[PDB]
Subunit: 274 residues, 2 copies
């Protein structure tokens, strides 16, 4: 199948993780992108170029969407062509702080649909993988989402986002308040969308939601959630859309829809538009 | 030290408790309620505490105890000058119930109302955090050191949302988070346990922790781990840390700690030494 590509992606993710693990122990030269909290290092850029060059060598006809390449001006247009969607370091803020949740994420799409995903949580050495119809795994353990259908007994994960616009922050915190006071059992944040979603795939959390993420944040981990038996959808309640900047990844449609009901949507530029 | 024997024993008990927790987290559970539908307890919380207290009692029968589930059973949380074991059998019960992979056993040891050593065992991770006053802080044998960051706008904070769901209180918690977030700081994280949050500050992986609503047993173990890693403990008023006050800032340094105190509005709470 696409098994050969996927096996290759796993090896590449592991080599990239090694690079990240070595770098996290050394001095940080922190650079800014769009804001004082939108960070990047040479390691983000070096890993992405290593991944893309390696994939290009083995699969010259394939396409790429990568976070830092987009920063370099490349487009985030998803065609039917086999496409590697890469976040070279998901959790750069974690990375520069040595907060031990840092992931390399690779999603592989054919006909605009994800066929496999790989998320390597580098510091804890957890390799999360899933291939469509083949199940989801972490380090040899098959994953299953939780069974919880009662929102008042749920544990959620989310992130506060990269915006510091007071209006936007107020909405993010207001959405959190509404969910919190349903009540739910709690809300957690480990600082990486990919790893948050993998935690839902393991059943250790019941659902994740976030507005403001990008296709590369969720392309790897989405299929890991669904192959664990979970569901993806938009915070609008509509179908999940890789390019829409919005995601609920949950154990089931009952929690997912209950969460969507509470979330006030924020306007966001799609990844596939100017 | 004469307390060194106590500490060695504490490390032994913590690992033992940790093994019990790690086994139970894979199994089905009876989840019970304490003060509210979101304030949870399991048979494991209670069993681990009973085991820890009885073990310590047999070996040091003149010592005092402050334990979370014992207080729930009616025992007094008053700290005297007597050697006192301050115990959270499972810090992270909601995590435990969900198999969210951050769960800690915490033991703090006070003499003359001052913590002499702390032990925090992060069960799922297999990370034993320890510190004896004057002797430094360690994680699995490796010496810990807090971060150097003095610029709040380049800091990473940890905190928790708390057990209250009272709208007014939640609004204050979130308002405090908003003020810090918009300074700005680089980010805020929550792994679901005060003890582990503080141990992350000890390692330098986070720059500071703050919370109002914790109890002495949440922070008794990890507090000295932070300070022996080079950090500071402080009240949210910027004043001296008060173990029984329900409030804490645990930071890499006083510059960040005072900056955080500046933004925080205090939430009214019953002290651990009040009825
Ligand atoms: Mn980035
Ligand atoms: Mn990234
Ligand atoms: Mn990312
Ligand atoms: Mn409790
Ligand atoms: Mn507890
Ligand atoms: Mn606790």
């Amino acid at each position: 199948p696409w098994q050969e590509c996927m096996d290759y992606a796993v090896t590449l993710a592991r080599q990239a993780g090694e690079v990240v693990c070595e770098a996290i122990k050394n001095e940080m030269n922190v650079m800014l992108k769009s804001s004082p909290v939108d960070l990047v290092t040479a390691t983000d850029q070096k890993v992405e170029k290593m991944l893309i060059s390696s994939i290009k060598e083995k699969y010259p006809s394939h396409s790429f969407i990568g976070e830092e390449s987009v920063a370099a001006g490349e487009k985030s247009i998803l065609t039917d062509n086999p496409t590697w969607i890469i976040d070279p370091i998901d959790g750069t803020t974690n990375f520069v702080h040595r907060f031990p949740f840092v992931a390399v994420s690779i999603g592989f799409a054919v006909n605009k649909k994800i066929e496999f995903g790989v998320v390597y949580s580098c510091v804890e050495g957890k390799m999360y993988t899933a291939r469509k119809g083949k199940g989801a795994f972490c380090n040899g353990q098959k994953l299953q989402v939780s069974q919880q259908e009662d929102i008042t007994k749920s544990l959620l994960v989310t992130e506060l986002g990269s915006s510091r616009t007071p209006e936007t922050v107020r909405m993010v915190l207001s959405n959190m308040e509404k969910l919190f006071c349903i009540p739910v059992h709690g809300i957690r944040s480990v600082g990486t969308a990919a790893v948050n979603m993998c935690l839902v795939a393991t059943g250790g959390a019941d659902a994740y939601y976030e507005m403001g993420i990008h296709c590369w944040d969720v392309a790897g981990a989405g299929i890991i959630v669904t192959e664990a038996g979970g569901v993806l959808m938009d915070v609008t309640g509509g179908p999940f859309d890789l390019m829409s900047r919005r995601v609920i990844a949950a154990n089931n449609r009952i929690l997912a829809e209950r969460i969507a009901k509470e979330i006030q949507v924020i306007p966001l530029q799609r990844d596939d538009e100017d």
